[PDB]
Amino acid sequence: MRIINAEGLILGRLASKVAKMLLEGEEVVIVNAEKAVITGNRDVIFKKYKQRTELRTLTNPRRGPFYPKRSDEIVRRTIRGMLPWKTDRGRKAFKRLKVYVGIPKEFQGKELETIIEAHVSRLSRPKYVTVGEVAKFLGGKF
Amino acid sequence: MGKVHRPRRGSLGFSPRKRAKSIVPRIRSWPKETEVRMLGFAGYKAGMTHILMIDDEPGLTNGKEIFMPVTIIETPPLRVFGIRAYRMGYLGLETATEVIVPKLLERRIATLPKNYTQEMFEQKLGQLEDMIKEGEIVDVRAIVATQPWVIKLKKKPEVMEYAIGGTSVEEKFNYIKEKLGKELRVGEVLKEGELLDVIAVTKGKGTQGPVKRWGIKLRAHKDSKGRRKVGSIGPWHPARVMWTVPMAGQMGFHHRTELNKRLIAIGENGKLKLDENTEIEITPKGGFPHYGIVRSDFMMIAGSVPGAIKRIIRVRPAIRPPKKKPPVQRPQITYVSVESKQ
RNA sequence: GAGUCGUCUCGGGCGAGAGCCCAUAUCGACCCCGAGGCUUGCUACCUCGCUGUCGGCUCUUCCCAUCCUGGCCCUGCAGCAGGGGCCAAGGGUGGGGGUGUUCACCCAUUAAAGGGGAACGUGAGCUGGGUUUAGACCGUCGUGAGACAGGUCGGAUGCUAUCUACCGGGGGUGUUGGCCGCCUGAGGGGAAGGUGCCCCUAGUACGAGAGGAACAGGGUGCCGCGGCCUCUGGUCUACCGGUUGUCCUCCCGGGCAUCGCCGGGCAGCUACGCCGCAGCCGAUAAGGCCUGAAAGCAUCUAAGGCCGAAGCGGCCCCCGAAAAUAGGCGGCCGUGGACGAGGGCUCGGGUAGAAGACCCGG
RNA sequence: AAACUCCGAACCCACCGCCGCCGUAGAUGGGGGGAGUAGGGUGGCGGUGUAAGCCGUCCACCGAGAGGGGAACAACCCAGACCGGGGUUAAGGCCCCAAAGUGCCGGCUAAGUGUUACUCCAAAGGGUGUCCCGGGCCUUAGACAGCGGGGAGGUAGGCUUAGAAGCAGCCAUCCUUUAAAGAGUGCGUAACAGCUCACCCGUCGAGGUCCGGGGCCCCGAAAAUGGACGGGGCUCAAGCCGGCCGCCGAGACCCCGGCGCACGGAGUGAUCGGGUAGGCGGGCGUGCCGGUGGCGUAGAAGCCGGGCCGUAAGGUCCGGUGGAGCCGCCGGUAUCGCGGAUCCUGCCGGGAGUAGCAGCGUAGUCGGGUGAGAAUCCCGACCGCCGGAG
RNA sequence: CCGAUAGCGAACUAGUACCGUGAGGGAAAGCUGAAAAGCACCCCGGGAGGGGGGUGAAAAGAGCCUGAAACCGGGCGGCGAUAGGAGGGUGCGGCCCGAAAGGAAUGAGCCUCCCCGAAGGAAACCGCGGCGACGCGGGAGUACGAGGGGAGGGGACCGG
């Protein structure tokens, strides 16, 4: 098992690497999926997340696309879209990932934090938002 | 038509219409989270009657007569049978522990020890622990029950939750504690002249039509096959039916909140003590249609109340005050009525 | 329908020219370049062992190049009132008269009476008025039979839902052995609110005068939606009364004329009845700016920073342990061929109710 | 300057020689028998038509031809495919889904541009937005902007006009003198006056302002179920352009054996293996005949289920059932082999235990009798319907 | 030459049944057993039906020689109430049985050793280069390799 403190971490790099590792047979647990960072213009990152949630298939049967409002779920959903869920290995893969909100563990396992894209640079990147801010705006609990 | 904008018929602000998952009203606003006393007081709707009052709120100008219907409700005395502690988790609020405290107890369908004395003392000690720490606990709410025994509509206790506010967690704990060993009053929680919300599961019609649920306008000169049918439901693509379109199915047995009904009067009996203002304790002769004997603490509240006759209704303080009218502390009752519903 | 975009609709660039003077307060030619699929047409791809037309009606979704409401900028903006520009689909955008009419014309209201796509939305939903067959007349043409994007009258709308969709209701498992009660709030939905008038402001600001605003506070109306019948109105083949014919010999008491008819009306159900349906804040648009360079200055931006929409979220209303992160708490239980906790069927009624369920008493 | 030419390629084609390759297991050519006789399509070169569409011509190819790649995608790419096995590349890709790069150097980027050869992916115009090259002006002969001082005298230039006195307007626009001066840039005045600039010297004590090509990125940019880069997501890259390097990755290509075909007599083939229309050739099975040779109650055929062989069509054997007929071999023969015909017929399931057994002027109900069984058979009582006409 | 959804429409009361005003049109229906011994007698069942027992064979007991498939019921083996479909093909696991015709006990799946060995072809580490990614020399066509041969071990399934 890996407990990753994903404070600082670009959601996509963590998810790609996590999606391959869970498929290998490993267990990842993400702690701090709300203090993690996403770069980009603020306006577009909010417009993408809102649009998804808003769906409303055409008026919404009580089926079709749901997208969640809370950031903790957003990371967890992001790694699942990178896995399948109608293939055996994938459907299982989704149960090997769990999100815990904040850190209520006393462990920190394996950490990737390398500066290559996967962790930010705070003095070389022109603009970013913390994800928690956007989740609040969407109307989540957190 | 000619692209004629037509306002929607039915709503999505209240839809869906269906059966309530419990006959206990639902709450998602708490007006006594950080403020003492329960979220109002619960009774059974006796019926309605009407009363003539003097402005109060200006119909035109103050000092003019106004007609107002009022719903008279036999409330039972309520009594705290359980202390609930919460601990805040990280997926929402989760239940720390509880104290459970005991022929009505027999009529209730709820599980019973079988070693009453023992179980109760362990939960109670557990609670003192939780209370001390004291920040484990972030709020405390009360399991509270009705007591019908002079009231003939039903004689089982309907059991519900009301929060008990307080400034801080230790204070809510002391207050709740005193309360278990005691009865309660219409007088204690509530006072006349506030605006209060009313929560209830409305009367069940059973299954009703598109005519009744959504409203269906009538049609042309002559119609051979009906005017109460659905018409179009939709195009060729979309290839599927929506839910925004007229259908038949359940209307009623749904929880409804109606806001801001002014508290006119509090007394006890009825019709065994006669007052010339604040209502004469209006009790119809021949009794009420389809409702049991009245004799207990009562409240007669303004306007409409969700819930037809013979149904358990609950009251909640308001989540807003009036907004171009002033509140009046203690309504004024110019003259009275003693009419029959027969 | 697809393809197509000449035609159509709409945009952008250049600015001849008039507007006393001053191209852009406003109006705007010549020419040049795109976008859309909404008119027309081209295509012959798809169907001739059928993919039924148009219009209306009813019912609903989506889009903005936005008619109105909100927030904003200019002016050849004195006021009152226009003209032009920017954001914005949350909500609203009506009733009549002619036409079969989509469209178009007209009347008076209105804050405004916006458009377009969805099988030229909507016929296994209605209607069948129009295109329109076999009957007929008239005009034109033909030797004639007979013809008409000439006129005209009259001329069938089938089907018990197999599959699947959506709205409501049950029965069970998974539910980390089962169970009874109480909750958590993942998410999903929303317009629960919209809009207008009047008085005070003020006969004021502003104007030579004529004339005449705004912020803010009260009262009321309208529309939508939801609930509720005590009042008042509807109904009521519970019941009661009056009454024609006829039958029972018959007073009495009844049948029938398919409640005989008429008169009254309780409960209950309803409107043509009554009652209810926030604010604020944060973050943002358009916009107004601060500091402040590139360009020692100046400059709202190039970085940093302050405000600011009916729109966006919270707040609010509706649903919601089968949310598989399958949840929490408290209590109750087990331990053909032993014993048997919970639970139903039973009975008397409903606050409930198509079957079932639900609820309560026993 | 299609239908003009003082002219004219690349290129096509005739012929001879050579060289190459092919051929005597028969090429080159002739005669005979049997056919089939709707086309499409990318590119080049076109003609028409806004276009899409149509039509010429040559064409890889699809048609009739798989496989791997282009997200999928008749004809775009790689590749032409006997059976089985092993290996390695090609097209293309290397952040994850998904095999293989959280590749390397440098420049471009700040738009979520792009991440799409594509069928998918919008323009003229314009931005001291960027980066990079060009020559001009000009550098203590240092204004590039600031700032401290500047804006003279002739003179009101004249006309017009009360005034036009820089400043209603028209035309001219000259000369002297220098921190400095334009018959005056704007304000201002009825017109003046007055305020002020360009301009200059000097301080600040520098490299200064320009203009002009290019690449990119921004603006220009409005649409109807949730649709887009294949999806997720990605901004020191998982982006772009110019280099470079290591791998992944086909039935291809390589390789071992087997198999057919072609050829060799009474092993050999780099130069063999896709296949519709159509032609050609071989075998199997079916009924009966004839000839030949066998089998049966000590158990036939048929049926059912299982085993085995042959690329196959098909055959054989065993166990149960059945209770009288049955094969093989060779030469003949045809009312001789079925997946489809909105095929004909028989049998059977779903629909369903649904609809229908309600609609028209709408009849039963209580005792008792009988009987294996009684709501609707009968008897008794009570109540109807029809009544010049159920 | 054909053989009872064939040959005459008709092998069996057939041009019959049957339809149509008429003219005229027009089917289907073959098989007990050697001998009927075609079921006495008894229990049950209102029961004439059926069931129990006795009936050479009755699975020849009454359109009865034989007795197919579709289909219906129960059962056995596998799967199954949080996961996806032209219903499968190929490889590899699970569970399930398999007396016979197959191959093998005169040795089956299986295992082990030794050797030959196509196409192909490393590693450790070292040296020298390259802005670096990484290349080059030596290790080395070596180790290694499909496939085949022989020998050995084990003793019942394996195929299907």
PDB file of all heavy atoms in Angstrom, chain E residues 53-61:
ATOM      1  P     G E  53     -48.730 -53.315  -9.207  1.00  0.00           P
ATOM      2  OP1   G E  53     -47.269 -53.439  -8.826  1.00  0.00           O
ATOM      3  OP2   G E  53     -49.064 -52.764 -10.574  1.00  0.00           O
ATOM      4  O5'   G E  53     -49.461 -54.710  -8.993  1.00  0.00           O
ATOM      5  C5'   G E  53     -49.299 -55.333  -7.726  1.00  0.00           C
ATOM      6  C4'   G E  53     -50.162 -56.622  -7.768  1.00  0.00           C
ATOM      7  O4'   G E  53     -51.639 -56.342  -7.647  1.00  0.00           O
ATOM      8  C3'   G E  53     -50.141 -57.638  -9.021  1.00  0.00           C
ATOM      9  O3'   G E  53     -48.969 -58.486  -9.009  1.00  0.00           O
ATOM     10  C2'   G E  53     -51.444 -58.387  -8.796  1.00  0.00           C
ATOM     11  O2'   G E  53     -51.220 -59.292  -7.736  1.00  0.00           O
ATOM     12  C1'   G E  53     -52.395 -57.248  -8.406  1.00  0.00           C
ATOM     13  N9    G E  53     -53.032 -56.592  -9.600  1.00  0.00           N
ATOM     14  C8    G E  53     -52.683 -55.414 -10.259  1.00  0.00           C
ATOM     15  N7    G E  53     -53.515 -55.148 -11.225  1.00  0.00           N
ATOM     16  C5    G E  53     -54.446 -56.208 -11.256  1.00  0.00           C
ATOM     17  C6    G E  53     -55.531 -56.484 -12.146  1.00  0.00           C
ATOM     18  O6    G E  53     -55.824 -55.705 -13.108  1.00  0.00           O
ATOM     19  N1    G E  53     -56.148 -57.698 -11.791  1.00  0.00           N
ATOM     20  C2    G E  53     -55.738 -58.537 -10.702  1.00  0.00           C
ATOM     21  N2    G E  53     -56.391 -59.740 -10.578  1.00  0.00           N
ATOM     22  N3    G E  53     -54.763 -58.208  -9.894  1.00  0.00           N
ATOM     23  C4    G E  53     -54.119 -57.090 -10.260  1.00  0.00           C
ATOM     24  P     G E  54     -48.419 -59.034 -10.434  1.00  0.00           P
ATOM     25  OP1   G E  54     -47.157 -59.847 -10.201  1.00  0.00           O
ATOM     26  OP2   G E  54     -48.238 -57.847 -11.278  1.00  0.00           O
ATOM     27  O5'   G E  54     -49.542 -60.031 -11.077  1.00  0.00           O
ATOM     28  C5'   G E  54     -49.815 -61.234 -10.328  1.00  0.00           C
ATOM     29  C4'   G E  54     -50.959 -62.064 -10.857  1.00  0.00           C
ATOM     30  O4'   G E  54     -52.257 -61.379 -10.674  1.00  0.00           O
ATOM     31  C3'   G E  54     -50.825 -62.363 -12.348  1.00  0.00           C
ATOM     32  O3'   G E  54     -49.957 -63.497 -12.631  1.00  0.00           O
ATOM     33  C2'   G E  54     -52.330 -62.550 -12.735  1.00  0.00           C
ATOM     34  O2'   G E  54     -52.748 -63.813 -12.370  1.00  0.00           O
ATOM     35  C1'   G E  54     -53.024 -61.474 -11.924  1.00  0.00           C
ATOM     36  N9    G E  54     -53.123 -60.220 -12.761  1.00  0.00           N
ATOM     37  C8    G E  54     -52.524 -58.966 -12.467  1.00  0.00           C
ATOM     38  N7    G E  54     -52.821 -58.110 -13.329  1.00  0.00           N
ATOM     39  C5    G E  54     -53.782 -58.604 -14.130  1.00  0.00           C
ATOM     40  C6    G E  54     -54.336 -58.012 -15.303  1.00  0.00           C
ATOM     41  O6    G E  54     -54.128 -56.861 -15.649  1.00  0.00           O
ATOM     42  N1    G E  54     -55.101 -59.003 -15.970  1.00  0.00           N
ATOM     43  C2    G E  54     -55.312 -60.308 -15.589  1.00  0.00           C
ATOM     44  N2    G E  54     -55.836 -61.120 -16.538  1.00  0.00           N
ATOM     45  N3    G E  54     -54.820 -60.799 -14.424  1.00  0.00           N
ATOM     46  C4    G E  54     -54.032 -59.930 -13.806  1.00  0.00           C
ATOM     47  P     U E  55     -49.795 -64.093 -14.130  1.00  0.00           P
ATOM     48  OP1   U E  55     -51.073 -64.511 -14.745  1.00  0.00           O
ATOM     49  OP2   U E  55     -48.714 -65.145 -14.054  1.00  0.00           O
ATOM     50  O5'   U E  55     -49.246 -62.838 -14.993  1.00  0.00           O
ATOM     51  C5'   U E  55     -49.134 -62.842 -16.417  1.00  0.00           C
ATOM     52  C4'   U E  55     -50.439 -62.531 -17.171  1.00  0.00           C
ATOM     53  O4'   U E  55     -51.025 -61.345 -16.570  1.00  0.00           O
ATOM     54  C3'   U E  55     -50.360 -62.246 -18.697  1.00  0.00           C
ATOM     55  O3'   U E  55     -50.320 -63.496 -19.437  1.00  0.00           O
ATOM     56  C2'   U E  55     -51.579 -61.503 -18.878  1.00  0.00           C
ATOM     57  O2'   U E  55     -52.726 -62.260 -19.118  1.00  0.00           O
ATOM     58  C1'   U E  55     -51.733 -60.657 -17.607  1.00  0.00           C
ATOM     59  N1    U E  55     -51.312 -59.209 -17.647  1.00  0.00           N
ATOM     60  C2    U E  55     -50.019 -58.818 -17.620  1.00  0.00           C
ATOM     61  O2    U E  55     -49.056 -59.613 -17.554  1.00  0.00           O
ATOM     62  N3    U E  55     -49.753 -57.408 -17.897  1.00  0.00           N
ATOM     63  C4    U E  55     -50.740 -56.489 -18.179  1.00  0.00           C
ATOM     64  O4    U E  55     -50.440 -55.357 -18.546  1.00  0.00           O
ATOM     65  C5    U E  55     -52.067 -56.982 -18.155  1.00  0.00           C
ATOM     66  C6    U E  55     -52.278 -58.318 -17.896  1.00  0.00           C
ATOM     67  P     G E  56     -50.108 -63.617 -20.976  1.00  0.00           P
ATOM     68  OP1   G E  56     -49.976 -62.241 -21.509  1.00  0.00           O
ATOM     69  OP2   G E  56     -51.269 -64.372 -21.483  1.00  0.00           O
ATOM     70  O5'   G E  56     -48.726 -64.321 -21.203  1.00  0.00           O
ATOM     71  C5'   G E  56     -47.990 -65.020 -20.095  1.00  0.00           C
ATOM     72  C4'   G E  56     -46.609 -65.364 -20.515  1.00  0.00           C
ATOM     73  O4'   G E  56     -46.586 -66.404 -21.486  1.00  0.00           O
ATOM     74  C3'   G E  56     -45.754 -64.221 -21.200  1.00  0.00           C
ATOM     75  O3'   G E  56     -45.424 -63.261 -20.221  1.00  0.00           O
ATOM     76  C2'   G E  56     -44.604 -65.073 -21.692  1.00  0.00           C
ATOM     77  O2'   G E  56     -43.879 -65.577 -20.568  1.00  0.00           O
ATOM     78  C1'   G E  56     -45.412 -66.195 -22.298  1.00  0.00           C
ATOM     79  N9    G E  56     -45.696 -65.937 -23.730  1.00  0.00           N
ATOM     80  C8    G E  56     -46.959 -65.777 -24.318  1.00  0.00           C
ATOM     81  N7    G E  56     -46.904 -65.558 -25.604  1.00  0.00           N
ATOM     82  C5    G E  56     -45.561 -65.709 -25.920  1.00  0.00           C
ATOM     83  C6    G E  56     -44.925 -65.456 -27.169  1.00  0.00           C
ATOM     84  O6    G E  56     -45.468 -65.182 -28.239  1.00  0.00           O
ATOM     85  N1    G E  56     -43.521 -65.574 -26.998  1.00  0.00           N
ATOM     86  C2    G E  56     -42.833 -65.837 -25.851  1.00  0.00           C
ATOM     87  N2    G E  56     -41.467 -65.948 -26.040  1.00  0.00           N
ATOM     88  N3    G E  56     -43.444 -66.090 -24.684  1.00  0.00           N
ATOM     89  C4    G E  56     -44.792 -66.005 -24.781  1.00  0.00           C
ATOM     90  P     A E  57     -45.862 -61.759 -20.242  1.00  0.00           P
ATOM     91  OP1   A E  57     -45.707 -61.207 -18.872  1.00  0.00           O
ATOM     92  OP2   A E  57     -47.182 -61.635 -20.839  1.00  0.00           O
ATOM     93  O5'   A E  57     -44.874 -61.134 -21.222  1.00  0.00           O
ATOM     94  C5'   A E  57     -43.496 -61.020 -20.936  1.00  0.00           C
ATOM     95  C4'   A E  57     -42.719 -60.617 -22.194  1.00  0.00           C
ATOM     96  O4'   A E  57     -42.939 -61.620 -23.204  1.00  0.00           O
ATOM     97  C3'   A E  57     -43.308 -59.315 -22.769  1.00  0.00           C
ATOM     98  O3'   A E  57     -42.653 -58.157 -22.259  1.00  0.00           O
ATOM     99  C2'   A E  57     -43.021 -59.494 -24.220  1.00  0.00           C
ATOM    100  O2'   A E  57     -41.734 -59.115 -24.561  1.00  0.00           O
ATOM    101  C1'   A E  57     -43.154 -60.990 -24.480  1.00  0.00           C
ATOM    102  N9    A E  57     -44.473 -61.295 -24.977  1.00  0.00           N
ATOM    103  C8    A E  57     -45.555 -61.845 -24.330  1.00  0.00           C
ATOM    104  N7    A E  57     -46.510 -62.195 -25.137  1.00  0.00           N
ATOM    105  C5    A E  57     -46.053 -61.903 -26.356  1.00  0.00           C
ATOM    106  C6    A E  57     -46.653 -62.093 -27.647  1.00  0.00           C
ATOM    107  N6    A E  57     -47.905 -62.593 -27.659  1.00  0.00           N
ATOM    108  N1    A E  57     -45.875 -61.821 -28.784  1.00  0.00           N
ATOM    109  C2    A E  57     -44.601 -61.302 -28.552  1.00  0.00           C
ATOM    110  N3    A E  57     -43.987 -61.046 -27.334  1.00  0.00           N
ATOM    111  C4    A E  57     -44.740 -61.462 -26.305  1.00  0.00           C
ATOM    112  P     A E  58     -43.528 -57.067 -21.585  1.00  0.00           P
ATOM    113  OP1   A E  58     -42.525 -56.252 -20.817  1.00  0.00           O
ATOM    114  OP2   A E  58     -44.654 -57.758 -20.916  1.00  0.00           O
ATOM    115  O5'   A E  58     -43.957 -56.132 -22.760  1.00  0.00           O
ATOM    116  C5'   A E  58     -45.028 -56.301 -23.676  1.00  0.00           C
ATOM    117  C4'   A E  58     -46.212 -55.261 -23.516  1.00  0.00           C
ATOM    118  O4'   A E  58     -47.426 -55.977 -23.788  1.00  0.00           O
ATOM    119  C3'   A E  58     -46.464 -54.584 -22.128  1.00  0.00           C
ATOM    120  O3'   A E  58     -47.295 -53.315 -22.191  1.00  0.00           O
ATOM    121  C2'   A E  58     -47.357 -55.721 -21.574  1.00  0.00           C
ATOM    122  O2'   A E  58     -48.182 -55.138 -20.535  1.00  0.00           O
ATOM    123  C1'   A E  58     -48.262 -55.969 -22.701  1.00  0.00           C
ATOM    124  N9    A E  58     -49.011 -57.249 -22.662  1.00  0.00           N
ATOM    125  C8    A E  58     -48.789 -58.349 -21.880  1.00  0.00           C
ATOM    126  N7    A E  58     -49.517 -59.390 -22.177  1.00  0.00           N
ATOM    127  C5    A E  58     -50.332 -58.938 -23.205  1.00  0.00           C
ATOM    128  C6    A E  58     -51.513 -59.483 -23.786  1.00  0.00           C
ATOM    129  N6    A E  58     -52.062 -60.724 -23.332  1.00  0.00           N
ATOM    130  N1    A E  58     -52.100 -58.816 -24.753  1.00  0.00           N
ATOM    131  C2    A E  58     -51.579 -57.612 -25.082  1.00  0.00           C
ATOM    132  N3    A E  58     -50.544 -56.943 -24.538  1.00  0.00           N
ATOM    133  C4    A E  58     -49.957 -57.642 -23.583  1.00  0.00           C
ATOM    134  P     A E  59     -46.746 -51.895 -22.085  1.00  0.00           P
ATOM    135  OP1   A E  59     -46.202 -51.727 -20.697  1.00  0.00           O
ATOM    136  OP2   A E  59     -47.790 -51.014 -22.567  1.00  0.00           O
ATOM    137  O5'   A E  59     -45.510 -51.937 -23.091  1.00  0.00           O
ATOM    138  C5'   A E  59     -45.128 -50.639 -23.701  1.00  0.00           C
ATOM    139  C4'   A E  59     -43.682 -50.799 -24.214  1.00  0.00           C
ATOM    140  O4'   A E  59     -42.740 -50.301 -23.228  1.00  0.00           O
ATOM    141  C3'   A E  59     -43.125 -52.191 -24.575  1.00  0.00           C
ATOM    142  O3'   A E  59     -43.451 -52.504 -25.925  1.00  0.00           O
ATOM    143  C2'   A E  59     -41.619 -51.993 -24.339  1.00  0.00           C
ATOM    144  O2'   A E  59     -41.085 -51.268 -25.433  1.00  0.00           O
ATOM    145  C1'   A E  59     -41.607 -51.088 -23.080  1.00  0.00           C
ATOM    146  N9    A E  59     -41.613 -51.985 -21.854  1.00  0.00           N
ATOM    147  C8    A E  59     -40.883 -53.158 -21.662  1.00  0.00           C
ATOM    148  N7    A E  59     -41.138 -53.681 -20.459  1.00  0.00           N
ATOM    149  C5    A E  59     -42.036 -52.838 -19.841  1.00  0.00           C
ATOM    150  C6    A E  59     -42.570 -52.901 -18.536  1.00  0.00           C
ATOM    151  N6    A E  59     -42.259 -54.048 -17.753  1.00  0.00           N
ATOM    152  N1    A E  59     -43.464 -51.829 -18.188  1.00  0.00           N
ATOM    153  C2    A E  59     -43.723 -50.948 -19.144  1.00  0.00           C
ATOM    154  N3    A E  59     -43.168 -50.729 -20.382  1.00  0.00           N
ATOM    155  C4    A E  59     -42.370 -51.789 -20.674  1.00  0.00           C
ATOM    156  P     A E  60     -42.887 -53.846 -26.584  1.00  0.00           P
ATOM    157  OP1   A E  60     -42.586 -54.791 -25.461  1.00  0.00           O
ATOM    158  OP2   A E  60     -41.831 -53.513 -27.567  1.00  0.00           O
ATOM    159  O5'   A E  60     -44.045 -54.402 -27.402  1.00  0.00           O
ATOM    160  C5'   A E  60     -45.393 -54.237 -26.929  1.00  0.00           C
ATOM    161  C4'   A E  60     -46.455 -54.218 -28.001  1.00  0.00           C
ATOM    162  O4'   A E  60     -46.347 -55.469 -28.735  1.00  0.00           O
ATOM    163  C3'   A E  60     -47.844 -54.227 -27.482  1.00  0.00           C
ATOM    164  O3'   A E  60     -48.238 -52.887 -27.284  1.00  0.00           O
ATOM    165  C2'   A E  60     -48.608 -54.951 -28.544  1.00  0.00           C
ATOM    166  O2'   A E  60     -48.824 -54.246 -29.738  1.00  0.00           O
ATOM    167  C1'   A E  60     -47.663 -56.098 -28.817  1.00  0.00           C
ATOM    168  N9    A E  60     -47.813 -57.282 -27.928  1.00  0.00           N
ATOM    169  C8    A E  60     -47.017 -57.665 -26.823  1.00  0.00           C
ATOM    170  N7    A E  60     -47.513 -58.684 -26.220  1.00  0.00           N
ATOM    171  C5    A E  60     -48.698 -58.998 -26.819  1.00  0.00           C
ATOM    172  C6    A E  60     -49.608 -60.024 -26.622  1.00  0.00           C
ATOM    173  N6    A E  60     -49.445 -60.932 -25.657  1.00  0.00           N
ATOM    174  N1    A E  60     -50.662 -60.095 -27.530  1.00  0.00           N
ATOM    175  C2    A E  60     -50.700 -59.169 -28.459  1.00  0.00           C
ATOM    176  N3    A E  60     -49.947 -58.104 -28.733  1.00  0.00           N
ATOM    177  C4    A E  60     -48.899 -58.102 -27.912  1.00  0.00           C
ATOM    178  P     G E  61     -48.708 -52.298 -25.970  1.00  0.00           P
ATOM    179  OP1   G E  61     -48.126 -50.991 -25.854  1.00  0.00           O
ATOM    180  OP2   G E  61     -48.468 -53.230 -24.891  1.00  0.00           O
ATOM    181  O5'   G E  61     -50.238 -52.139 -26.248  1.00  0.00           O
ATOM    182  C5'   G E  61     -50.981 -53.388 -26.330  1.00  0.00           C
ATOM    183  C4'   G E  61     -52.431 -53.172 -25.851  1.00  0.00           C
ATOM    184  O4'   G E  61     -52.916 -54.419 -25.250  1.00  0.00           O
ATOM    185  C3'   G E  61     -52.744 -52.024 -24.870  1.00  0.00           C
ATOM    186  O3'   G E  61     -54.025 -51.451 -25.086  1.00  0.00           O
ATOM    187  C2'   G E  61     -52.718 -52.917 -23.560  1.00  0.00           C
ATOM    188  O2'   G E  61     -53.456 -52.394 -22.478  1.00  0.00           O
ATOM    189  C1'   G E  61     -53.440 -54.169 -23.964  1.00  0.00           C
ATOM    190  N9    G E  61     -53.193 -55.293 -22.977  1.00  0.00           N
ATOM    191  C8    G E  61     -52.190 -55.424 -22.063  1.00  0.00           C
ATOM    192  N7    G E  61     -52.244 -56.508 -21.372  1.00  0.00           N
ATOM    193  C5    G E  61     -53.360 -57.187 -21.895  1.00  0.00           C
ATOM    194  C6    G E  61     -53.799 -58.494 -21.571  1.00  0.00           C
ATOM    195  O6    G E  61     -53.277 -59.225 -20.705  1.00  0.00           O
ATOM    196  N1    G E  61     -54.897 -58.837 -22.305  1.00  0.00           N
ATOM    197  C2    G E  61     -55.506 -58.052 -23.268  1.00  0.00           C
ATOM    198  N2    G E  61     -56.788 -58.453 -23.565  1.00  0.00           N
ATOM    199  N3    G E  61     -54.983 -56.840 -23.738  1.00  0.00           N
ATOM    200  C4    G E  61     -53.959 -56.458 -22.923  1.00  0.00           C
TER     201        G E  61
END
